[PDB]
Amino acid sequence: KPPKGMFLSQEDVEAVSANATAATTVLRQLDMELVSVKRQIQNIKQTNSALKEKLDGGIEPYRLPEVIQKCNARWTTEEQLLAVQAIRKYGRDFQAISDVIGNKSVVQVKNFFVNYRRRFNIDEVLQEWEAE
Amino acid sequence: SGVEGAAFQSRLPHDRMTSQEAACFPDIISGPQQTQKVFLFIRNRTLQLWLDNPKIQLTFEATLQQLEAPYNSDTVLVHRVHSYLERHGLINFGIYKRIKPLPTKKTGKVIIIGSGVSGLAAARQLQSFGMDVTLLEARDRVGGRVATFRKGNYVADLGAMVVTGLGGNPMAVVSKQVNMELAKIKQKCPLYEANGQAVPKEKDEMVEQEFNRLLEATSYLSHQLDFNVLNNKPVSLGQALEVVIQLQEKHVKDEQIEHWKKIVKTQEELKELLNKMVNLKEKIKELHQQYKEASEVKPPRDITAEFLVKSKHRDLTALCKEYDELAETQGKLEEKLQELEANPPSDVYLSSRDRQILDWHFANLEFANATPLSTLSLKHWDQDDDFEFTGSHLTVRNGYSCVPVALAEGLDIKLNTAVRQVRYTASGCEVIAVNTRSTSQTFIYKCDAVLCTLPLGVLKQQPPAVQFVPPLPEWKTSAVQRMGFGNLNKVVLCFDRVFWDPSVNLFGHVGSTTASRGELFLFWNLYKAPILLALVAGEAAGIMENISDDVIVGRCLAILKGIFGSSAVPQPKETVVSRWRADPWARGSYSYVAAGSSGNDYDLMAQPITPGPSIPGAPQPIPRLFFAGEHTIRNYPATVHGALLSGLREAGRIADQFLGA
Ligand SMILES: Cc1cc2nc3c(=O)[nH]c(=O)nc-3n(C[C@H](O)[C@H](O)[C@H](O)COP(=O)(O)OP(=O)(O)OC[C@H]3O[C@@H](n4cnc5c(N)ncnc54)[C@H](O)[C@@H]3O)c2cc1C
Ligand SMILES: O=CCCc1cc(F)cc(F)c1OCc1ccccc1
């Protein structure tokens, strides 16, 4: 029931009146606390400003052009050999494997796993990828 | 309504009997509701007839002829009600033409100390009741703290000047009996900071509102946190205001710390993100170089060389996608951080100019209570608040003294007679007084009863101005110690021409420091002739009493010259400065509810003193020493109407004692 925007907790009233010079001590430590928070903002601004200066140039010198490839249903020998290496490197990451081959959907990759499971020792190859 | 208005104008509930009435009509209040309603109508209608014409005595026969059936059937009841109203001063008080001339046989002898308003009102009553009354007055005039300066056409009140609302106010009746020129006080009151410039309306209103909110806060502090004793002493209004202000200053700092901490938290979240990006950029830079080398192994290549190009390509675009998301998050954080950097909470609770204008409002409260806020009881300082009259405040244009002078007509008043000693025993009283002009002339007044209306300041005096033999009991002297008696002074400035705003009755001067906030803080334009009154309140009151009039008037003219211009303010033709604390017949201005006191001390002040028996084993004596004055009336202290009411009370009490009820 205090007036709106007035602030009057029992806790604070006792703190400002427990002692003859309690109030000024309270407001003093709050002042110094604000000083050390502003000091700390200055350090992080200046630290972040140096980081931004390293990101000058973005990653534009390093972005490759994006090629779209018509997703083909048929597996050339070359594309099979890519997939086996992609399995060796990426494991069950069907998306990464699709991106490496370029013309094979995530489903076609997953289907490839079963059909050539036997002939390509795909189980051995997954075990091989797990050792590192 | 009419009969209902009569009750309201007599400060009575119209539909209920009071404790006083219960005491004189126990048969009626303990009896059926129907008779209580009949009683209440008789009382309200008798009050009404009196109020509708307070210039002539309302007699019992007159009253009865005006009552109509069924109410005029119980003539004993009507006569009882009329006698009760008359005896207690609710009808036939003040100055009225008497139908039946006063009987020559007087009964009992009363000495009244003091011929201020309380003393005079009691005296008129007691004489109306058939008693022999003499007033002893130390000054060379009546009125006491109603004190009007008169010189030429200049008229200005050095003491009381405001009649509060007329609704319920007994001064309403008096004003129909005396030619008082009452004039409304327009409460518009511009403030001028110490540089003579006006306070902008924006600021005048902000700070006044904050002032009202700080008061509510102290009351919350009092009633909800029970912050009423601190380090074994009663908390004062001023002290509670300090705590409230300290906490508002604390909250501003708490709010700043919370705000800059949100900025730190966000900055650090951004720092962590940038480090993530810088490392990712390097990882991307190195990966590109690898994709570049592998793709420069020119075809035709075996399928592992092809896989190297295509998987470096894949790894690089993924890292680029990761980097693009981190850079989207970076722009959102820099947004959040630019909004925070633009929403800073308030810098200060009050600026210096604010706190000065605030001090003016505190000085205004120190004026109304005639005392520094550090002396007011936090718990009780506004305890008479529920009794405020209704209507506009008014000034007495022809000088408030017209009231006590009018009341004095017909009374036996010994001016220039300072009471030195009050003697009261089971057989009667002796009042010993001296001539103030030559103190060697001693006077003895013997009487059945003494009504003491000495100001609370005089009762407080150590060593005493007035000795009571036997000494007042401790329950009364302790009350006298606890009660506050404050101080307030006025500077009357009489010019030959009006240079202020004529349509503005008040204007304020905002002092530069808290210490000086009460010093000449308020000016009044109230009179027909060009007169300004300037107030000295709070801590300034007592200090300015030890400064010469020429310096005080100088400070006044300096303030006014700053507000209105140096060429606009001529020298005053006449000036007067009050020094009420130094006045030995007052020793202050009026009472206040001090920290450590309360409303019950006003009841204690009002209680009469009863001496012990002369012969031991003799029956209980009657009371002999009575008290009236503004310090004796709980619900209307520190006013003229309170003093008048207190005299009416004591006269009923004394007459009941010595004439019988
Ligand atoms: C500056 C000032 C401004 C005020 N403002 C207002 C206002 O505008 N409106 C309002 O309603 N009230 C106001 N008041 C209060 C009001 O004036 C008083 O409450 C009231 O007039 C006092 O009445 P009283 O009869 O109790 O005391 P007083 O009028 O003080 O009567 C006591 C009398 O006893 C006399 N006396 C003292 N010592 C002795 C002695 N030893 N022997 C004999 N006689 C003695 C005194 O001289 C005096 O005449 C103000 C008071 C002051 C001083
Ligand atoms: O000059 C005299 C003022 C003294 C005074 C003391 C009271 F206790 C009550 C009053 F009515 C009052 O007089 C008018 C007033 C009212 C409110 C604020 C300031 C003054």
From Swiss-Prot, chain A:
Residues 23-58 form a coiled coil. It comes from Homo sapiens. The keyword Coiled coil applies. The SANT domains may bridge the nucleosomal substrates and the demethylase KDM1A. One of its GO terms (molecular function) is enzyme binding. Transmembrane segments: none annotated. This is REST corepressor 1. One of its GO terms (cellular component) is histone methyltransferase complex. Residues 1-73 are annotated as: Interaction with KDM1A. Interacts directly with GFI1 and GFI1B in a RCOR/GFI/KDM1A/HDAC complex. Interacts with INMS1. Component of a BHC histone deacetylase complex that contains HDAC1, HDAC2, HMG20B/BRAF35, KDM1A, RCOR1/CoREST and PHF21A/BHC80. The BHC complex may also contain ZMYM2, ZNF217, ZMYM3, GSE1 and GTF2I. Interacts with REST. Interacts with the SMARCE1/BAF57, suggesting that the BHC complex may recruit the ATP-dependent chromatin-remodeling SWI-SNF complex. Interacts with SOX2. (Microbial infection) Interacts with herpes virus HSV-1 ICP0 protein; the interaction leads to the disruption of the BHC complex, thereby preventing the BHC complex from repressing transcription of viral genes. Residues 70-121 form the SANT domain.
UniProtKB/Swiss-Prot annotation, chain B:
The modification Phosphoserine is found at residue 440. Keywords: Acetylation, Chromatin regulator, Chromosome, Coiled coil, Cushing syndrome, Developmental protein, Disease variant, FAD, Flavoprotein, Isopeptide bond, Nucleus, Oxidoreductase, Phosphoprotein, Repressor, Transcription, Transcription regulation, Ubl conjugation. The N-terminal sequences of INSM1 and SNAI1 compete with histone H3 for the same binding site and thereby inhibit histone demethylation (in vitro). It is found in: Nucleus; Chromosome. One of its GO terms (biological process) is positive regulation of neuron projection development. Its EC number is 1.14.99.66. There is a cross-link at residues 271, 298 (Glycyl lysine isopeptide (Lys-Gly) (interchain with G-Cter in SUMO2)). Ubiquitously expressed. The modification N6-acetyllysine is found at residues 261-262, 265. Its cofactor is FAD. FAD binds at residues 118, 137, 139, 145, 161-162, 630, 639-640. Residues 3-102 form the SWIRM domain. GO terms for cellular component: chromatin; chromosome, telomeric region; DNA repair complex; histone methyltransferase complex; nucleoplasm; nucleus; protein-containing complex; transcription regulator complex. Changing residue 89 to R: In AIMAH3; uncertain significance. Residues 129-661 are annotated as: Demethylase activity. Acetylated by KAT8 in epithelial but not in mesenchymal cells, thereby regulating the epithelial-to-mesenchymal transition. Acetylation by KAT8 reduces KDM1A association with nucleosomes, thereby decreasing histone H3 demethylation, leading to transcription activatio of target genes. Component of a histone demethylase complex with RCOR1. Component of a RCOR/GFI/KDM1A/HDAC complex. Interacts directly with GFI1 and GFI1B. Interacts with INSM1 (via N-terminus). Component of a BHC histone deacetylase complex that contains HDAC1, HDAC2, HMG20B, KDM1A, RCOR1 and PHF21A. The BHC complex may also contain ZMYM2, ZNF217, ZMYM3, GSE1 and GTF2I. In the complex, RCOR1/CoREST strongly enhances the demethylase activity and protects it from the proteasome while PHF21A/BHC80 inhibits the demethylase activity. Interacts with the androgen receptor (AR). Histone demethylase that can demethylate both 'Lys-4' (H3K4me) and 'Lys-9' (H3K9me) of histone H3, thereby acting as a coactivator or a corepressor, depending on the context. Acts by oxidizing the substrate by FAD to generate the corresponding imine that is subsequently hydrolyzed. Acts as a corepressor by mediating demethylation of H3K4me, a specific tag for epigenetic transcriptional activation. Demethylates both mono- (H3K4me1) and di-methylated (H3K4me2) H3K4me. May play a role in the repression of neuronal genes. Belongs to the flavin monoamine oxidase family. This is Lysine-specific histone demethylase 1A. The gene is KDM1A.
